[PDB]
Design an enzyme around this catalytic site. Structure first.
Site, PDB file in Angstrom:
ATOM      1  N   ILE A  16       1.098  -1.277   0.194  1.00  0.00           N
ATOM      2  CA  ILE A  16       0.037   0.090  -0.045  1.00  0.00           C
ATOM      3  C   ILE A  16       0.797   1.415   0.062  1.00  0.00           C
ATOM      4  O   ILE A  16       0.526   2.263  -0.427  1.00  0.00           O
ATOM      5  CB  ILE A  16      -1.032  -0.122   1.062  1.00  0.00           C
ATOM      6  CG1 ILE A  16      -0.431   0.295   2.509  1.00  0.00           C
ATOM      7  CG2 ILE A  16      -2.111  -1.128   1.201  1.00  0.00           C
ATOM      8  CD1 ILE A  16      -0.246   1.607   3.046  1.00  0.00           C
ATOM      9  N   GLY A  17       1.997   1.289   0.595  1.00  0.00           N
ATOM     10  CA  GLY A  17       2.953   2.365   0.519  1.00  0.00           C
ATOM     11  C   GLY A  17       4.131   1.758   0.165  1.00  0.00           C
ATOM     12  O   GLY A  17       4.654   0.800   0.422  1.00  0.00           O
ATOM     13  N   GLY A  19       8.699   3.592  -0.591  1.00  0.00           N
ATOM     14  CA  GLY A  19       9.897   4.584  -0.437  1.00  0.00           C
ATOM     15  C   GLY A  19       9.754   5.137   1.002  1.00  0.00           C
ATOM     16  O   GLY A  19      10.881   5.191   1.589  1.00  0.00           O
ATOM     17  N   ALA A  20      11.620   2.382   3.869  1.00  0.00           N
ATOM     18  CA  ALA A  20      10.556   1.467   4.452  1.00  0.00           C
ATOM     19  C   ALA A  20       9.273   1.386   3.325  1.00  0.00           C
ATOM     20  O   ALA A  20       9.300   2.472   2.729  1.00  0.00           O
ATOM     21  CB  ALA A  20       9.993   1.928   5.742  1.00  0.00           C
ATOM     22  N   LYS A  21       8.812   0.219   3.064  1.00  0.00           N
ATOM     23  CA  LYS A  21       7.725  -0.020   2.640  1.00  0.00           C
ATOM     24  C   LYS A  21       6.553  -0.830   3.275  1.00  0.00           C
ATOM     25  O   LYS A  21       6.906  -1.426   4.338  1.00  0.00           O
ATOM     26  CB  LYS A  21       7.812  -0.508   1.034  1.00  0.00           C
ATOM     27  CG  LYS A  21       8.387  -2.122   1.090  1.00  0.00           C
ATOM     28  CD  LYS A  21       8.773  -2.749  -0.181  1.00  0.00           C
ATOM     29  CE  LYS A  21       8.701  -4.288  -0.267  1.00  0.00           C
ATOM     30  NZ  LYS A  21       8.918  -4.789  -1.500  1.00  0.00           N
ATOM     31  N   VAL A  22       5.432  -0.655   2.988  1.00  0.00           N
ATOM     32  CA  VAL A  22       4.240  -1.313   3.555  1.00  0.00           C
ATOM     33  C   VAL A  22       3.301  -2.069   3.009  1.00  0.00           C
ATOM     34  O   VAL A  22       2.687  -1.938   1.904  1.00  0.00           O
ATOM     35  CB  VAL A  22       3.509  -0.182   4.409  1.00  0.00           C
ATOM     36  CG1 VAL A  22       2.063  -0.759   5.126  1.00  0.00           C
ATOM     37  CG2 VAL A  22       4.451   0.460   5.389  1.00  0.00           C
ATOM     38  N   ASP A 126       8.297  14.018  15.639  1.00  0.00           N
ATOM     39  CA  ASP A 126       8.106  13.993  14.460  1.00  0.00           C
ATOM     40  C   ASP A 126       6.392  14.019  14.208  1.00  0.00           C
ATOM     41  O   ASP A 126       5.985  13.323  13.131  1.00  0.00           O
ATOM     42  CB  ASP A 126       8.885  13.139  13.411  1.00  0.00           C
ATOM     43  CG  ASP A 126       8.421  12.992  12.039  1.00  0.00           C
ATOM     44  OD1 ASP A 126       8.453  14.456  11.314  1.00  0.00           O
ATOM     45  OD2 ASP A 126       8.581  12.164  11.312  1.00  0.00           O
TER      46      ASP A 126
HETATM   47  N1  LIG Z   1       6.499   9.270   8.099  1.00  0.00           N
HETATM   48  C1  LIG Z   1       6.138   8.226   7.325  1.00  0.00           C
HETATM   49  C2  LIG Z   1       5.300   6.820   7.587  1.00  0.00           C
HETATM   50  C3  LIG Z   1       5.457   5.698   6.773  1.00  0.00           C
HETATM   51  N2  LIG Z   1       4.246   5.137   6.769  1.00  0.00           N
HETATM   52  C4  LIG Z   1       3.911   3.947   7.695  1.00  0.00           C
HETATM   53  O1  LIG Z   1       4.682   3.338   8.054  1.00  0.00           O
HETATM   54  C5  LIG Z   1       2.557   3.540   7.194  1.00  0.00           C
HETATM   55  N3  LIG Z   1       1.812   4.017   6.396  1.00  0.00           N
HETATM   56  N4  LIG Z   1       0.276   3.494   6.275  1.00  0.00           N
HETATM   57  C6  LIG Z   1       0.397   2.588   7.435  1.00  0.00           C
HETATM   58  C7  LIG Z   1       1.872   2.465   8.027  1.00  0.00           C
HETATM   59  C8  LIG Z   1       2.358   1.740   9.162  1.00  0.00           C
HETATM   60  C9  LIG Z   1       1.120   1.128  10.187  1.00  0.00           C
HETATM   61  C10 LIG Z   1      -0.152   0.862   9.128  1.00  0.00           C
HETATM   62  N5  LIG Z   1      -1.197   0.254   9.218  1.00  0.00           N
HETATM   63  N6  LIG Z   1      -2.261   0.342   8.225  1.00  0.00           N
HETATM   64  C11 LIG Z   1      -1.866   1.209   7.320  1.00  0.00           C
HETATM   65  N7  LIG Z   1      -2.080   1.735   6.285  1.00  0.00           N
HETATM   66  C12 LIG Z   1      -3.289   1.573   5.454  1.00  0.00           C
HETATM   67  C13 LIG Z   1      -3.649   2.273   4.505  1.00  0.00           C
HETATM   68  C14 LIG Z   1      -4.693   2.380   3.746  1.00  0.00           C
HETATM   69  C15 LIG Z   1      -5.291   1.041   3.945  1.00  0.00           C
HETATM   70  C16 LIG Z   1      -5.201   0.261   4.833  1.00  0.00           C
HETATM   71  F1  LIG Z   1      -5.631  -1.090   4.931  1.00  0.00           F
HETATM   72  C17 LIG Z   1      -4.052   0.204   5.625  1.00  0.00           C
HETATM   73  C18 LIG Z   1      -0.530   1.565   7.854  1.00  0.00           C
END
Ligand SMILES: NCCCNC(=O)c1n[nH]c2c1CCc1n[nH]c(Nc3cccc(F)c3)c1-2
Length: 309
Positions: A16-17, A19, A20-22, A126
């Site tokens: 879902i994310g 550039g 760490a990736k998620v 942050d």
């Molecule tokens: N300063 C930049 C931060 C980097 N981003 C993340 O770690 C991050 N971004 N999104 C997430 C995380 C970790 C925990 C985390 N749990 N759920 C989501 N995102 C998420 C986003 C959309 C739909 C969905 F099902 C999940 C995340």
């Protein structure tokens, strides 16, 4: 082969994310959805150890929960509470700005998380809308404790080289929620640095006198003249419509254990309840920590406390 250990516990889904990736994933033993934060070790580093150590020690209704730390030769995996609601950032962008009433609902949750972080002896350092996610109940969850003890969000004294700085960042956040843009912004970093030092910002027409007064207390350049966290918990503005202070104390204990969760794990582990409790309460953030905490989350979501063996 970097994913071998992980695939024993979770079935991976779409990233879902990046550039760490998620990556979205499912925890097999509980069937619970999780998010897996994948970081490379070579292409990076103590920023990660900082965070992991923080999240091991912090546990709260408004902090995105760490379930599980796995480490391979190349990778580090962090299995985290799944927040489908997305970032606060994207939500402000869709709405343009939040009403004072909706800002208050959200802001109370931020104060709760940050007040607790301070109670535990940490500063987040942050705080920004990108670091706040909504869960499936549209509850805020705080993320990314990597810089813990964005220039737009940095307190003057932090910029100039701990908990006062967080109050300032919460101030910027408060402004953004209600305004939809930064109080201090510029193309050029040193010009931005200067605006922040001067502390003067536009005060938009739609802000209430009470909003403006809170903003002014939080966004004091001199950290000693700035409202303290304790006084923020029961500020008149914060109390409006609620008539009780922010509840910042953690539910989600380290000490009290859930009996049903202990029981179901006991049957999996074929041990007695006292052995299972001692084992859980070591909190090693291995698959046991993940399964215990995910069984607890299954239960709060009104689902049966059930493993899939
Ligand atoms: N300063 C930049 C931060 C980097 N981003 C993340 O770690 C991050 N971004 N999104 C997430 C995380 C970790 C925990 C985390 N749990 N759920 C989501 N995102 C998420 C986003 C959309 C739909 C969905 F099902 C999940 C995340």
């Amino acid at each position: 082969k970097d994913y071998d250990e992980l695939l024993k516990y979770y079935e991976l889904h779409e990233t879902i994310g990046t550039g760490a990736k998620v990556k979205l994933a499912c925890h097999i033993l509980t069937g619970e959805m999780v998010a897996i934060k994948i970081m490379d070790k070579n292409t990076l580093l103590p920023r990660i150890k900082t965070e992991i150590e923080a999240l091991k020690n912090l546990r709260h209704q408004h902090i995105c929960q760490l379930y599980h730390v796995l480490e391979t030769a190349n990778k580090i995996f962090m299995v985290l509470e799944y927040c489908p609601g997305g970032e606060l950032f994207d939500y402000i962008i869709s709405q343009d700005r939040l009403s004072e009433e909706e800002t208050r609902v959200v802001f109370r949750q931020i104060v709760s998380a940050v007040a607790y972080v301070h109670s535990q002896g940490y500063a987040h350092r942050d705080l920004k809308p990108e670091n706040l996610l909504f869960d499936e109940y549209h509850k805020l969850k705080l993320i990314d404790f990597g810089l813990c003890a964005s220039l737009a969000y940095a307190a003057p004294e932090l910029i100039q080289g701990g908990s006062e700085a967080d109050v300032w960042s919460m101030g910027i956040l408060l402004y953004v929620l209600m305004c939809g843009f930064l109080p201090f912004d510029d193309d050029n970093v040193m010009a931005l640095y200067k605006k922040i030092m001067r502390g003067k910002y536009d005060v938009p027409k739609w802000l209430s006198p009470s909003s403006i007064l809170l903003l002014q207390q939080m966004l004091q350049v001199d950290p000693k003249k700035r409202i303290s966290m304790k006084n923020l918990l029961n500020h008149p503005w914060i109390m409006q419509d609620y008539n009780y202070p922010v509840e910042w104390q953690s539910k989600n204990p380290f000490i009290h254990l859930d009996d049903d969760c202990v029981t179901e794990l006991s049957v999996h582990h074929r041990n007695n309840r006292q052995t299972m409790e001692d084992l859980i309460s070591l909190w090693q953030y291995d698959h046991l920590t993940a399964t215990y905490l995910l069984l607890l989350a299954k239960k709060a979501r009104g689902k049966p406390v059930r493993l899939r063996l």
